[PDB]
């Protein structure tokens, strides 16, 4: 329950972030969110985390590393 | 509070933070220096196959298409076959290296091979030689690598072993084995080479090898593919690649594509605009990309940079691996590479191929014009997207080998140059990467390009390269180069930023290369420099002066030319620039001018003498960079004037006497480094830098966003909270003032002083108790009373501290400590004194003790009073002093100024205070003589209130308040009788007088005195904002008195 | 000198 609702929380908290320090905060949090989106054994948390990746973060999702994570995401049990 | 408390008030030694960065930088690995230049010279074509002879090892089938070099004339008979195949191998190898020496041998035997190898060794011995074995139509090699020669008879066989070839082939060499079990040959070769090297102890490391497939497996037979699949892959990659592509795709998504169209593709394979040339262009880019991205550096350089032919063969070898994998064959090579056929980049290749073939119908068929591909545009887009965040603590871009070759065309070149420049904002990291990958010789060739629009980019690129690669030994200068940048700087219309960069480039060229110091004279750089002195741009003037100095260094003819055009006088006119950096540049250049005079004397010694005088006046300058560069330039002068100081030094122990005065004044300056260097120069004579910082500037990143423009920066929050603290402390003091003030009958502070509290001072915020003794400044925490550390001032035995002040009322001020001998020692590091007691600097204020008053909102500092005059220093520009000759007759006073006007008050002299407005002419200095104190005046000072009366104390104790406009209109109280001093607090109804006994006396503006406050007296000090009185008693304690 | 036929 903590994981679910707090992932939702951070997803909402990075709505306003975007200065350089804010850019670094966004980058670090997106890394920490993408790693949960892939590796967590629970399926529901993976689904929700991937669903929460709103369009507003596209400038960070176009980076190479995050693209590799997403391209790994295409092949899954669900 | 913080909205206004954060004033636009820079610190006087703020620029010290930049000025003291007298440092250099680091060099590079410079792996680009390909000292190994071993090229390949000649090639041997060993066509051992006998046409029409089927060895017993093989059993063919009907679809055994035995194409070799795409040509299968088993119909034509054996002789035509051998002739044609030899000719075609010749033609194919010429496509990759036309310049070699080609020798053919079709069905050799033994003495043919021995003679051929001997001739090859005679032709060359260090340059590599290529050799390859066909190796079809002969039995399979043995465990000894034996190879069957035939004596024009298949039964008459000779099995030549590896050892004979190793003996015959001793020089550096490349071997290619298109056998069935070629890996066996390679393995046996390495074993035999080990045995040979062991015998040499009673050639390895000079041998490259490529093998068709592993020892335990044979080449496949495919109905459609050539029999010489490995050779074709290493030799003609495009044709086999396209043909395999059309044959191998499981489901075709481009109908109409067929081998008939593939055999008719228009192009040349050497014209990037044509289809086939474009396809080579993409292929080369992709393969270099993979090779750079999977290998370490040294292997990459060895395989892909030393030699052209080796690089081409390995470039094709990667494709060979990809194609061979699908038919159960692993190619084998000398030093092995990691497995590469899973790399994502290969997908790009497939996509690109499709697009071209997707339009190959209706081009061949109808003649519709060919369209160009979007590959390089997309790669540039990806590189840009990586740049947009550009963090250097991660991987570098994967596309850098692609933009390297995008530079080589003439279509996207501007955009690639722009992106490379952005990549080279950036740090030494990006410079190192872009240098290691290559690039720079191509830019050196672009220097000779006729496109002038490429000028601003190239300059900037070079402006970074020489900034980091300062040790570059001017390969550009050899191919003109210096002349190109001379013509660049000759342009006046070019922006001042690019002119400054070109000036720096020319400076580095002259500095780092002697023939550069000649070429600057060949092109008349001195005249161009003297012309470019007429620009407000500071750095451009600095580099103009530095170029002039470096030109004059090590050439007497340059020095003569500088005399000829009166270069030194124009340089002397540069000394009127407020900026200390430009004046340091002028000082350096003049010192170098005199130093390179070579003691020719003639009439120019007078000029040299003048140059000495040209610097001597700058002893009046207080700027630290100027002082340090002055002592350096004086060393550059005395290197010659020591020829005649051998007599004149006895004066110190006309021109030479003034030089002694200059060096002694610089020795007498309180600043530690200047005094130490000046004493070293004085000792060196008597017994008988900024350039680095300026060059260091360019290598720094450009287009920096300040930390204070980031809204969430910690600096902004910390500054705001500090200024709120200070504002609220001042507001508490204002509340104390507004609520009403009683006699200071309460205590806040009481603590021991180790010595005399001669002077006492505080902040206009949380007032850390600063107290000066003769030779130290000791601190106490005010709110708690905790004693803190002290700064030892290094004062002489005959020197006390006579005053103290601060350089900011709101921010981290630097405490000034003014002493008897004219010195001022300065440091802000009283903040967190327990943690950072490192004091900052010192300088000369003077040239009644000494007193300093800083004009916070004007940038000036008024100084007194060992001199009879008033000394106004300016600290926000060229640090000079205005000398105001007042009418005082002796040491004057602690000065004060009512900031609303330029009103100054002065005097401890013959019975008058002298008050004048500086706006009047400073040669009369009309002063209001306040003669009511005919006795020896004491402590003339101003009220900062709107009323603005003149405060006065007698030596006899009379205390008087004059109307500023009427000396006759006065108020007299005469309170200091049996008391030691006076101190009014204009923001409060409080005036302290101390005592000669063990108590303290305070009185209100009406004169109402008390003499029984106890919590003689050397010092009295009201806090600048609190109505609280500090008493620096003569019992060596300090105490703060507070309102009840 | 150059490994590639550059256009200056």
Coordinates of C-alpha atoms in Angstrom, one line a residue, chain B residues 501-918:
Chain B
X501 CA 39.4 35.0 -29.3
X502 CA 41.5 35.6 -32.4
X503 CA 43.8 37.8 -30.4
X504 CA 44.2 35.0 -27.8
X505 CA 44.9 32.5 -30.6
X506 CA 47.6 34.8 -32.1
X507 CA 49.0 35.2 -28.5
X508 CA 49.2 31.5 -28.1
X509 CA 50.8 31.0 -31.5
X510 CA 53.5 33.6 -30.7
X511 CA 54.1 32.2 -27.2
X512 CA 54.3 28.5 -28.0
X513 CA 56.3 28.5 -31.2
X514 CA 59.5 30.3 -32.2
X515 CA 58.7 30.4 -35.9
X516 CA 55.5 31.9 -34.7
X517 CA 57.6 34.6 -33.1
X518 CA 59.1 35.1 -36.6
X519 CA 55.8 34.9 -38.5
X520 CA 54.2 37.6 -36.3
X521 CA 57.0 39.8 -37.6
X522 CA 56.6 38.6 -41.2
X523 CA 52.9 39.7 -41.2
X524 CA 53.5 42.9 -39.2
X525 CA 51.5 41.9 -36.1
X526 CA 52.9 44.9 -34.2
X527 CA 51.0 47.5 -36.3
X528 CA 47.8 45.5 -36.1
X529 CA 48.2 45.3 -32.3
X530 CA 48.7 49.0 -32.0
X531 CA 45.7 49.6 -34.1
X532 CA 43.6 47.3 -32.0
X533 CA 44.5 49.2 -28.8
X534 CA 41.5 51.4 -29.8
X535 CA 38.7 49.2 -28.5
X536 CA 36.7 49.4 -25.2
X537 CA 36.7 45.6 -25.0
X538 CA 39.0 44.8 -21.9
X539 CA 40.2 41.4 -22.8
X540 CA 41.0 42.5 -26.4
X541 CA 43.3 45.2 -25.0
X542 CA 44.9 42.8 -22.6
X543 CA 45.6 40.3 -25.4
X544 CA 46.9 43.1 -27.7
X545 CA 49.4 44.1 -25.0
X546 CA 50.3 40.5 -24.2
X547 CA 50.9 39.8 -27.9
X548 CA 53.0 42.9 -28.2
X549 CA 55.1 41.7 -25.2
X550 CA 55.5 38.2 -26.5
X551 CA 56.4 39.5 -30.0
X552 CA 59.1 41.7 -28.4
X553 CA 60.5 38.6 -26.5
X554 CA 63.5 36.9 -28.0
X555 CA 63.8 39.3 -31.0
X556 CA 65.8 42.5 -31.2
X557 CA 64.3 43.5 -34.6
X558 CA 60.8 43.4 -33.1
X559 CA 62.0 45.6 -30.3
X560 CA 63.5 48.0 -32.8
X561 CA 60.2 48.0 -34.8
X562 CA 58.3 48.8 -31.6
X563 CA 60.6 51.8 -31.2
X564 CA 60.1 52.7 -34.8
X565 CA 56.4 53.1 -34.7
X566 CA 56.5 54.5 -31.1
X567 CA 54.8 51.3 -29.9
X568 CA 55.9 51.8 -26.3
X569 CA 54.3 55.2 -26.1
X570 CA 51.0 54.0 -27.4
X571 CA 51.3 51.2 -24.9
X572 CA 52.0 53.8 -22.2
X573 CA 48.7 55.5 -23.1
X574 CA 47.0 52.2 -22.3
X575 CA 47.9 52.9 -18.6
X576 CA 44.9 55.2 -18.3
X577 CA 42.5 52.3 -18.4
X578 CA 40.5 51.9 -15.0
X579 CA 40.7 48.1 -15.3
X580 CA 43.7 46.8 -13.4
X581 CA 44.0 43.8 -15.8
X582 CA 44.7 46.0 -18.8
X583 CA 47.2 48.0 -16.9
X584 CA 48.9 44.8 -15.8
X585 CA 49.1 43.9 -19.5
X586 CA 50.7 47.2 -20.3
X587 CA 53.2 46.8 -17.4
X588 CA 54.2 43.3 -18.6
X589 CA 54.6 44.5 -22.2
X590 CA 56.7 47.5 -21.2
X591 CA 58.9 45.4 -18.9
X592 CA 59.4 43.0 -21.8
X593 CA 60.2 45.9 -24.1
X594 CA 63.0 47.1 -21.9
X595 CA 64.2 43.6 -21.2
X596 CA 64.5 42.9 -24.9
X597 CA 66.3 46.2 -25.6
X598 CA 69.4 43.9 -25.3
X599 CA 71.3 46.9 -23.8
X600 CA 72.0 48.3 -27.3
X601 CA 71.8 51.7 -25.5
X602 CA 72.3 54.0 -28.5
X603 CA 69.6 56.7 -27.9
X604 CA 67.0 54.2 -26.9
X605 CA 68.4 53.9 -23.3
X606 CA 66.6 57.3 -22.8
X607 CA 63.4 55.5 -24.0
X608 CA 64.2 52.7 -21.6
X609 CA 64.8 55.2 -18.8
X610 CA 61.4 56.8 -19.7
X611 CA 59.8 53.4 -19.5
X612 CA 61.2 52.9 -16.0
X613 CA 59.6 56.3 -15.0
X614 CA 56.5 55.2 -17.0
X615 CA 56.0 52.5 -14.3
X616 CA 57.3 54.4 -11.3
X617 CA 54.2 56.5 -10.8
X618 CA 52.1 53.4 -10.5
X619 CA 53.4 52.9 -7.0
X620 CA 50.6 55.3 -6.2
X621 CA 48.2 52.5 -7.3
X622 CA 46.9 50.2 -4.6
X623 CA 45.6 47.5 -6.9
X624 CA 47.1 44.1 -5.9
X625 CA 47.4 42.7 -9.4
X626 CA 49.1 45.9 -10.5
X627 CA 51.5 45.9 -7.6
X628 CA 52.5 42.3 -8.2
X629 CA 52.9 42.7 -11.9
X630 CA 54.9 45.9 -11.2
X631 CA 57.4 44.0 -9.1
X632 CA 57.6 41.4 -11.8
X633 CA 58.1 44.0 -14.5
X634 CA 60.7 45.7 -12.3
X635 CA 62.5 42.4 -12.3
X636 CA 62.3 42.4 -16.1
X637 CA 63.9 45.9 -16.0
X638 CA 66.6 45.4 -13.4
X639 CA 67.7 42.3 -15.4
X640 CA 69.4 45.0 -17.5
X641 CA 69.7 47.9 -15.0
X642 CA 71.8 45.7 -12.7
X643 CA 74.7 46.3 -15.2
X644 CA 75.0 49.8 -13.5
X645 CA 73.3 49.2 -10.1
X646 CA 76.7 47.9 -9.0
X647 CA 77.6 51.5 -8.2
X648 CA 74.1 53.0 -7.4
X649 CA 73.1 50.4 -4.8
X650 CA 75.2 52.1 -2.2
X651 CA 72.5 54.8 -2.0
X652 CA 69.9 52.2 -0.9
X653 CA 72.3 50.1 1.2
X654 CA 68.4 59.8 -11.1
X655 CA 66.6 56.9 -12.8
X656 CA 68.3 54.3 -10.7
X657 CA 67.5 56.2 -7.5
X658 CA 63.9 56.4 -8.4
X659 CA 63.9 52.7 -9.2
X660 CA 65.3 52.1 -5.7
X661 CA 62.5 54.3 -4.3
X662 CA 59.9 52.4 -6.3
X663 CA 61.2 49.0 -5.1
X664 CA 61.4 50.1 -1.5
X665 CA 57.9 51.5 -1.6
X666 CA 56.7 48.2 -3.0
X667 CA 58.7 46.5 -0.2
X668 CA 57.1 48.9 2.3
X669 CA 53.6 48.0 1.1
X670 CA 51.7 46.0 3.9
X671 CA 50.5 43.4 1.3
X672 CA 52.5 40.2 2.0
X673 CA 53.3 38.8 -1.4
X674 CA 54.1 42.3 -2.9
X675 CA 56.5 43.1 -0.1
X676 CA 58.1 39.7 -0.2
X677 CA 58.7 39.8 -3.9
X678 CA 60.0 43.4 -3.7
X679 CA 62.4 42.5 -0.9
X680 CA 63.6 39.5 -3.0
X681 CA 64.2 41.9 -6.0
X682 CA 65.9 44.5 -3.7
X683 CA 68.2 41.8 -2.2
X684 CA 69.0 40.3 -5.6
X685 CA 70.0 43.8 -7.0
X686 CA 71.9 44.9 -3.8
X687 CA 74.0 41.7 -3.5
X688 CA 75.1 42.4 -7.1
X689 CA 51.0 35.4 -13.5
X690 CA 48.0 37.3 -14.9
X691 CA 48.8 35.8 -18.4
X692 CA 48.3 32.3 -17.0
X693 CA 44.9 33.3 -15.6
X694 CA 43.9 35.1 -18.8
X695 CA 44.7 32.0 -20.9
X696 CA 42.9 29.9 -18.2
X697 CA 39.8 31.9 -18.8
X698 CA 39.1 30.6 -22.3
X699 CA 39.2 26.9 -21.3
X700 CA 36.4 27.5 -18.8
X701 CA 32.8 26.8 -19.9
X702 CA 31.0 29.6 -21.7
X703 CA 27.4 30.7 -21.4
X704 CA 27.4 29.8 -17.7
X705 CA 24.1 30.4 -15.9
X706 CA 24.9 31.9 -12.4
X707 CA 23.9 29.9 -9.3
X708 CA 21.8 32.8 -8.2
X709 CA 19.6 32.7 -11.3
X710 CA 18.4 29.2 -10.2
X711 CA 15.4 30.1 -8.0
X712 CA 15.8 27.0 -5.8
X713 CA 19.5 27.7 -5.3
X714 CA 20.7 27.3 -1.7
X715 CA 22.6 30.6 -2.1
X716 CA 19.4 32.6 -2.6
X717 CA 17.7 31.0 0.5
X718 CA 20.8 31.4 2.7
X719 CA 21.3 35.0 1.6
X720 CA 17.6 35.8 2.2
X721 CA 17.6 34.1 5.7
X722 CA 20.8 36.0 6.7
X723 CA 19.4 39.3 5.5
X724 CA 16.2 38.7 7.4
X725 CA 18.3 37.9 10.5
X726 CA 20.2 41.2 10.1
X727 CA 17.1 43.2 9.3
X728 CA 15.2 41.8 12.4
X729 CA 18.2 42.6 14.6
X730 CA 18.1 46.1 13.4
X731 CA 14.4 46.2 13.8
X732 CA 14.8 45.1 17.4
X733 CA 17.3 48.0 17.9
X734 CA 14.7 50.3 16.3
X735 CA 12.1 49.1 18.7
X736 CA 14.4 49.8 21.6
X737 CA 14.9 53.3 20.2
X738 CA 11.2 53.9 19.5
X739 CA 9.8 52.5 22.8
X740 CA 12.0 55.0 24.8
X741 CA 15.5 54.7 26.3
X742 CA 16.4 54.8 30.0
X743 CA 19.9 54.9 31.5
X744 CA 22.0 51.8 30.4
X745 CA 21.6 50.3 33.9
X746 CA 21.5 46.6 32.7
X747 CA 24.3 44.3 31.5
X748 CA 24.6 42.0 28.5
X749 CA 28.3 41.3 28.3
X750 CA 31.3 41.1 30.7
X751 CA 34.4 39.2 29.9
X752 CA 38.2 39.3 30.2
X753 CA 40.4 40.8 27.5
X754 CA 43.9 39.2 27.2
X755 CA 45.3 42.8 26.7
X756 CA 44.5 46.4 26.1
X757 CA 41.0 47.1 24.5
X758 CA 42.4 50.0 22.4
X759 CA 39.5 50.1 19.9
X760 CA 36.1 48.5 20.0
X761 CA 33.7 47.9 17.0
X762 CA 30.6 46.0 16.0
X763 CA 28.3 45.1 13.2
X764 CA 25.0 46.8 12.2
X765 CA 23.4 43.4 12.8
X766 CA 24.2 40.6 15.4
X767 CA 27.2 42.5 16.8
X768 CA 30.2 40.2 17.2
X769 CA 32.3 42.1 19.7
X770 CA 35.5 43.0 17.8
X771 CA 38.3 44.7 19.9
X772 CA 41.7 45.8 18.8
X773 CA 44.8 45.7 21.0
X774 CA 48.2 47.0 19.8
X775 CA 48.9 43.9 17.6
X776 CA 45.8 41.8 17.5
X777 CA 42.0 41.8 17.0
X778 CA 40.2 39.6 19.5
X779 CA 36.5 38.6 19.2
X780 CA 33.7 37.7 21.6
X781 CA 30.3 36.3 21.0
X782 CA 27.9 39.1 21.9
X783 CA 24.6 37.3 22.6
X784 CA 26.2 34.7 24.9
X785 CA 29.5 36.3 25.9
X786 CA 31.6 33.4 24.7
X787 CA 35.2 34.4 23.9
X788 CA 36.4 33.6 20.4
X789 CA 39.8 33.5 18.6
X790 CA 42.0 36.4 17.7
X791 CA 43.9 37.6 14.6
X792 CA 47.5 38.5 15.2
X793 CA 48.1 41.6 12.9
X794 CA 51.9 41.2 12.6
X795 CA 52.2 44.8 13.6
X796 CA 55.7 46.2 14.3
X797 CA 56.8 47.0 17.8
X798 CA 56.1 50.7 17.2
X799 CA 52.6 50.1 15.7
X800 CA 49.2 49.9 17.4
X801 CA 45.7 49.3 15.9
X802 CA 44.1 52.8 15.6
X803 CA 40.8 52.0 13.9
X804 CA 38.6 49.2 12.6
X805 CA 35.6 49.1 10.2
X806 CA 33.7 46.8 8.0
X807 CA 33.0 46.6 4.2
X808 CA 29.3 45.7 4.4
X809 CA 26.4 46.4 6.8
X810 CA 24.3 43.6 5.4
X811 CA 26.5 40.8 4.0
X812 CA 29.7 38.9 4.9
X813 CA 31.8 42.1 5.3
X814 CA 35.6 42.2 5.4
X815 CA 36.8 43.7 8.7
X816 CA 39.4 46.4 8.0
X817 CA 42.0 46.9 10.7
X818 CA 43.9 50.2 10.3
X819 CA 47.2 50.6 12.2
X820 CA 49.7 53.4 13.1
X821 CA 52.1 52.8 10.2
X822 CA 49.5 53.5 7.4
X823 CA 48.7 49.8 7.0
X824 CA 45.2 48.2 6.8
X825 CA 44.8 44.5 7.3
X826 CA 41.6 43.0 5.9
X827 CA 39.6 39.8 6.5
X828 CA 36.0 38.6 6.5
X829 CA 36.9 35.3 8.1
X830 CA 35.8 36.5 11.6
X831 CA 32.6 34.7 10.5
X832 CA 32.8 31.2 11.9
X833 CA 36.1 32.4 13.5
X834 CA 36.5 29.1 15.5
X835 CA 36.4 27.2 12.1
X836 CA 38.2 29.5 9.6
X837 CA 40.7 32.0 11.1
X838 CA 42.5 32.5 7.8
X839 CA 42.8 36.2 7.3
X840 CA 42.8 37.6 3.8
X841 CA 45.1 40.5 2.8
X842 CA 46.6 43.9 3.7
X843 CA 47.4 47.2 1.9
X844 CA 48.6 50.8 2.4
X845 CA 46.1 53.4 3.4
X846 CA 48.4 56.3 4.3
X847 CA 51.5 57.5 2.5
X848 CA 46.3 61.2 15.6
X849 CA 47.1 57.6 14.6
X850 CA 45.3 56.2 11.5
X851 CA 41.5 56.2 10.9
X852 CA 39.4 54.8 8.0
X853 CA 35.8 55.7 7.2
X854 CA 34.1 53.7 4.4
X855 CA 31.4 55.4 2.3
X856 CA 29.2 52.4 1.8
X857 CA 26.9 53.9 -0.9
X858 CA 29.7 55.6 -3.0
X859 CA 32.5 53.0 -3.0
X860 CA 35.0 55.4 -1.5
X861 CA 37.1 55.2 1.6
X862 CA 38.3 58.3 3.5
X863 CA 41.6 57.9 5.3
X864 CA 43.5 59.9 8.0
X865 CA 45.5 61.1 9.9
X866 CA 49.2 60.7 10.4
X867 CA 49.3 62.9 7.3
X868 CA 47.9 66.4 7.6
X869 CA 45.7 65.8 4.6
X870 CA 42.7 63.7 3.7
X871 CA 43.1 60.6 1.5
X872 CA 40.2 59.4 -0.6
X873 CA 40.7 55.9 -2.0
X874 CA 38.4 54.5 -4.6
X875 CA 38.0 50.7 -4.5
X876 CA 35.6 49.9 -7.3
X877 CA 38.0 50.9 -10.1
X878 CA 41.8 51.6 -10.5
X879 CA 42.7 51.8 -6.8
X880 CA 44.1 55.3 -6.6
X881 CA 44.0 58.0 -4.0
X882 CA 42.9 61.6 -4.1
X883 CA 45.0 63.9 -1.8
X884 CA 43.0 66.7 -0.3
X885 CA 45.3 69.4 1.3
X886 CA 43.3 70.7 4.2
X887 CA 44.5 73.5 6.4
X888 CA 45.4 71.3 9.4
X889 CA 48.9 71.8 10.9
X890 CA 49.5 68.3 12.4
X891 CA 48.0 64.8 12.7
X892 CA 44.4 65.4 12.1
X893 CA 41.6 63.2 13.5
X894 CA 39.1 60.4 13.1
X895 CA 37.2 61.6 10.0
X896 CA 33.5 61.4 9.3
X897 CA 31.3 62.3 6.3
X898 CA 27.6 63.1 6.2
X899 CA 26.7 61.0 3.1
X900 CA 24.0 63.4 1.9
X901 CA 26.7 65.8 0.7
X902 CA 30.5 65.7 0.2
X903 CA 31.0 67.2 3.6
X904 CA 34.2 66.3 5.6
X905 CA 35.3 67.3 9.1
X906 CA 38.8 67.2 10.4
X907 CA 41.2 68.4 13.1
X908 CA 43.3 67.9 16.1
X909 CA 45.4 71.0 15.8
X910 CA 45.7 74.6 16.7
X911 CA 42.3 75.3 18.2
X912 CA 39.9 74.8 15.3
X913 CA 37.8 72.1 13.5
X914 CA 38.2 72.4 9.7
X915 CA 35.0 71.5 7.9
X916 CA 34.6 71.7 4.1
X917 CA 32.6 70.4 1.2
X918 CA 34.8 68.6 -1.3

